[PDB]
From TrEMBL, chain A:
This is Pteridine reductase. PANTHER family: OXIDOREDUCTASE, SHORT-CHAIN DEHYDROGENASE/REDUCTASE FAMILY (AFU_ORTHOLOGUE AFUA_5G02870) (PTHR43639), SHORT-CHAIN DEHYDROGENASE_REDUCTASE FAMILY PROTEIN (PTHR43639:SF1). NADPH binds at R13, I14, H34, N35, S36, D61, L62, T63, N92, S94, Y156, K160, S189, L190. SUPFAM superfamilies: NAD(P)-binding Rossmann-fold domains. The lineage of its organism: Eukaryota, Discoba, Euglenozoa, Kinetoplastea, Metakinetoplastina.
TrEMBL record, chain C:
It holds the Pfam family adh_short_C2. PROSITE patterns: ADH_SHORT. The gene is PTR1. NADP(+) binds at residues 13-15, 35-37, 62-64, 93, 95, 158, 162, 189, 191-192. Substrate binds at S139. NADPH binds at R14, I15, H35, N36, S37, D62, L63, T64, N93, S95, Y158, K162, S191, L192. This is Pteridine reductase. InterPro entries: NAD(P)-bd_dom_sf (IPR036291), Pteridine_reductase (IPR014058), Sc_DH/Rdtase_CS (IPR020904), SDR_fam (IPR002347). Belongs to the short-chain dehydrogenases/reductases (SDR) family. The active site is at D145 (proton donor/acceptor), Y158 (proton donor/acceptor), Y158 (proton acceptor).
Amino acid sequence: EAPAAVVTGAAKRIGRAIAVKLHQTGYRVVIHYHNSAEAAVSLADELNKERSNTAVVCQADLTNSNVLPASCEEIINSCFRAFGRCDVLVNNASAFYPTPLVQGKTVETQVAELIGTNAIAPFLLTMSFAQRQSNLSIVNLCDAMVDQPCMAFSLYNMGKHALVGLTQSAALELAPYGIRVNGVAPGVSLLPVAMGEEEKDKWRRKVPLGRREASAEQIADAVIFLVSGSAQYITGSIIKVDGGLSLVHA
Amino acid sequence: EAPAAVVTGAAKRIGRAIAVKLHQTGYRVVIHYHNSAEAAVSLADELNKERSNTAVVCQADLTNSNVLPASCEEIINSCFRAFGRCDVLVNNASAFYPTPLVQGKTVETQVAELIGTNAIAPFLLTMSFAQRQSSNLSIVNLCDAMVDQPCMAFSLYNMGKHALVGLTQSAALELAPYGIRVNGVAPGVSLLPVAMGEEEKDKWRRKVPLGRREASAEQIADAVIFLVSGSAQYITGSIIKVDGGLSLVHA
Amino acid sequence: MEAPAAVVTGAAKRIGRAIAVKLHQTGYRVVIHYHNSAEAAVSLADELNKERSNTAVVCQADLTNSNVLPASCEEIINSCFRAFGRCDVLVNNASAFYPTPLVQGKTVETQVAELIGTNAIAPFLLTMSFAQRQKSNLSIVNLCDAMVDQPCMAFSLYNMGKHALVGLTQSAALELAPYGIRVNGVAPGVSLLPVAMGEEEKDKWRRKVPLGRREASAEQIADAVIFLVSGSAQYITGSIIKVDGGLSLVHA
Amino acid sequence: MEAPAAVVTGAAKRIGRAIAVKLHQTGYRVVIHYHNSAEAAVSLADELNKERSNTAVVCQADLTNSNVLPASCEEIINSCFRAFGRCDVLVNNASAFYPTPLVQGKTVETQVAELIGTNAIAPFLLTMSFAQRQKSSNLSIVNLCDAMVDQPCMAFSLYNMGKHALVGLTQSAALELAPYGIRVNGVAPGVSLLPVAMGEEEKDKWRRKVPLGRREASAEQIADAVIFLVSGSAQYITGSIIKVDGGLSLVHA
Ligand SMILES: NC(=O)c1ccc[n+]([C@@H]2O[C@H](COP(=O)([O-])OP(=O)(O)OC[C@H]3O[C@@H](n4cnc5c(N)ncnc54)[C@H](OP(=O)(O)O)[C@@H]3O)[C@@H](O)[C@H]2O)c1
Ligand SMILES: NC(=O)c1ccc[n+]([C@@H]2O[C@H](COP(=O)([O-])OP(=O)(O)OC[C@H]3O[C@@H](n4cnc5c(N)ncnc54)[C@H](OP(=O)(O)O)[C@@H]3O)[C@@H](O)[C@H]2O)c1
Ligand SMILES: NC(=O)c1ccc[n+]([C@@H]2O[C@H](COP(=O)([O-])OP(=O)(O)OC[C@H]3O[C@@H](n4cnc5c(N)ncnc54)[C@H](OP(=O)(O)O)[C@@H]3O)[C@@H](O)[C@H]2O)c1
Ligand SMILES: NC(=O)c1ccc[n+]([C@@H]2O[C@H](COP(=O)([O-])OP(=O)(O)OC[C@H]3O[C@@H](n4cnc5c(N)ncnc54)[C@H](OP(=O)(O)O)[C@@H]3O)[C@@H](O)[C@H]2O)c1
Ligand SMILES: Nc1nc2ccc(C(=O)NC(c3ccccc3)c3ccccc3)cc2s1
Ligand SMILES: Nc1nc2ccc(C(=O)NC(c3ccccc3)c3ccccc3)cc2s1
Ligand SMILES: Nc1nc2ccc(C(=O)NC(c3ccccc3)c3ccccc3)cc2s1
């Protein structure tokens, strides 16, 4: 009776907040993770303490390779194995780091990681979700700043642009199956763990609405809306949740 | 105690559905109308039967003129008079008709209606709303998902709707320091113009990827409800398409 | 009779003059429209006529919206036919630009008439008159703004007018395509800074431009107009070319 | 050594050929990159060298993504410096295009490698190699984009993803390379040269959708926009994508 959702990169930060809010809404959840095993298992424990048998973890590397289609099929299969259905896919997992055009990872590894996590894995996950098929939908975590990108982040930005293309192409192609495909695009939300406080404050000061970053819960709220019955005519839409950041000129 | 909302063009169709759903969410509402007095009062009666003294009507022509600024100030003022506050402005009223570039309203009348109602009145209402201002204050503008693939011979209408996107962005930036969010909802085909023939209505319905049907007014209202809610408190300057995928469909 | 002819609105100075000059150098006869800048307009027409006799005229009009604006726009197009017997190109360059804050000597209705009139309604009415007068490589070029999605604070009416001009560009490209009239736009970021602006403030904006940390010259903007009216753009309609040195790509 | 030089990928046929011809007519020396079309690439180089000796060479490479793609792309740029002593212009034109339906003899990872490699990864690697070699002059890159990226063909998700990635590259590289004086722009066709084997009755279905003339763009019309973007008339233009689509993208369903 309860619907089920897969959330990628769900052990921490925004993906954790999405998994938590879906669970609070009544979903059973697959918490996908790559390296954060302890955090993933800890979240599943918390959710299961709340309602038994409503959360599982599923480990996978979402870097592009010739076995990525199998890994993505397994993530979807894990939801059917645990819960007998898969109603919602949230493509949240993402690699993010600079790749300067002018000069420990080879460039082909950087392509595989940045384009794999942000674009190819979402595509393969979408394929597997659709092939295995109420209120079915997919939500892709996009980036409100894709047209005003950070300096030296070309591969990341290429991946996020590709994810916009996937959102639109899959919304078109999956509409006759009743599957909606939409996006949520943060501006600045939870800042990278590696970033110093002074730099975090630099970015906070740029946001018109409150001079602060989005909480993870604020991003999750837009995901909840798009999967809800209140969004049943919405497909191919990307909702910015950016406090007006993308409207601010240089 | 209860927040209050102004909805322009609220007597019928999409504006009515928005007013109904805001009311159901707990708002007190000003139902603005131009020509549709009977329908406006009928809605106010229905809402007041549910919760007494929670719905008022306000007449105004939203055509651009020397008096449009005073009329817009009165709409906002009516909310403050009735309810003591104005938390939400929904710019829903619109005129829609063709204005061919190559050839009984003069062109400058068409300007005053299409650009006035669809862009200048939202601008003046936004000024009045902001001037009169914990809280969750926002404005929602009814945009058009087809603004970049416009209907043939609708240049003035399309100009007004593009101007409304500009207002949404400019006002979101300028009002963010006041905690006033400014967002849009962009329908594709929703309730077809009453004048449109049944065969032409079906032609459009058949192009929509999602179920080959128009949006109900209630689906449009659901997006408005989200944007005014606490679930959207970091969202400003965003326009949510509610179009069943229609804008994605090539020629 | 066989050199083509162009109307350039707001052509006495700055970008509009550069467009008129470059069109003239390409072989066009030109109508130099102007509002207040009579001395500068006549001085330009005299220069162009010295270079080739009877190839430049001036035409005065206020492009503020009013119930007479349609007649004024009809008259601008008529001046081109009166002088040159044809009108091949329309460049909508004239523009009012000033802040209109949402929270507090012109009335708001004057500000609406000026900012929306010059930037949007006059281009629309000129587009109507241009199209209706037609009997070649016919086109319209609208001067847009690369920063319309990242607008200056407190410029809502200006930004509304430039957004409306994008809508006109696309609507008119669609509707006039059957008549062989192409309709395109050129969108500067920062080009010639306002005459009233001090050097320090100019340098603040210059420093934001990735390509050279400098504003576009007037000639650089005119170069993109010249391309869009040329035979090298015969399949281009409904396109807006940014000429902004990357400015619109730069985040906050 | 005074004439500038350009690399054009996928230049043996169709749009890339017309770009290579127009660049040569403008005074550029050209590297004609090709993958499978050797005879046509060599025929073009010989035609161009007959017009002006030692102004055209060919360079073969597969632009599918793989472990060797970065080296291949470095080699393409290197070929221009070895032939002509300079590389002023890069045109990323080569492209794979075919449907990849989401719902059900190439594996899906081959389709990823081909559609994302040709349309996006190879342009990125070529852009890296071009810039690293440059770390009077008018250096620029032109990417062949697609005016219909937001109204895509049904069941072309991987192709559309690659073309959206190419918009991202055009913008990100324009920003990052602007300090080096390298401009980065795009030209976005709607419908241009159709497949010759496509029935005329199907070609006409697409032609009739185009507002401006109810016909597809010639390859030369697309090349004309590339020529403008590399020219001295575009020296303040970077990060711009010029649609050359006859109004097709403005037409609703
Ligand atoms: N935070 C922001 O300000 C912001 C702004 C714009 C867009 N976004 C988007 O919003 C989403 C969530 O942002 P976030 O900051 O929460 O993300 P994040 O913490 O940077 O990354 C989310 C998770 O992605 C997973 N991931 C990384 N590489 C992976 C790989 N090779 N295989 C599988 N999983 C991998 C990691 O899982 P493990 O920890 O299990 O390894 C990581 O915890 C992302 O798509 C992001 O691009 C965020
Ligand atoms: N229906 C769709 O499929 C669709 C598609 C795209 C966008 N939209 C947008 O969605 C919104 C609502 O659409 P709708 O179809 O419900 O609108 P609508 O029925 O065409 O008109 C809404 C109301 O606007 C008011 N109005 C018109 N001209 C006016 C004037 N000069 N002064 C004051 N009020 C005036 C009218 O109120 P009175 O009846 O009181 O005179 C009318 O009932 C509009 O902004 C529209 O552009 C709708
Ligand atoms: N300069 C920039 O950095 C920049 C940036 C973005 C966009 N643009 C766009 O590029 C175009 C050219 O810019 P610019 O800086 O050269 O323009 P500008 O000097 O600010 O204005 C050009 C002309 O507009 C005419 N104008 C103003 N109000 C008018 C009215 N009520 N009626 C008729 N004409 C009127 C004036 O003519 P008179 O002098 O004869 O009165 C003025 O000379 C404009 O459309 C502008 O918005 C420029
Ligand atoms: N034609 C149109 O209507 C249209 C519409 C929109 C966008 N565009 C864009 O405009 C550009 C030119 O279009 P077009 O129709 O002339 O392209 P095309 O004929 O489909 O392809 C151009 C060339 O790409 C090369 N290519 C394909 N796969 C390759 C690989 N794996 N490695 C290396 N090279 C490869 C081929 O070279 P070989 O022949 O040597 O193997 C082919 O001749 C493309 O980027 C396209 O996406 C075209
Ligand atoms: N998986 C992840 N994706 C992203 C995407 C963006 C951000 C974020 O921090 N963006 C900031 C920023 C990025 C790099 C360096 C400094 C700040 C940002 C993005 C656009 C404008 C301003 C700040 C952080 C993450 S984490
Ligand atoms: N008719 C005219 N239209 C315009 C449009 C824009 C500008 C211009 O100066 N834009 C600047 C700027 C505007 C206001 C205050 C300071 C600087 C600009 C625009 C966008 C981003 C950064 C700077 C100047 C003019 S003059
Ligand atoms: N390397 C290449 N890239 C592209 C991109 C697009 C096209 C093209 O022909 N597009 C047509 C079309 C696509 C599929 C079937 C028939 C026609 C097109 C594209 C967008 C909307 C309508 C038609 C052809 C090519 S060839």
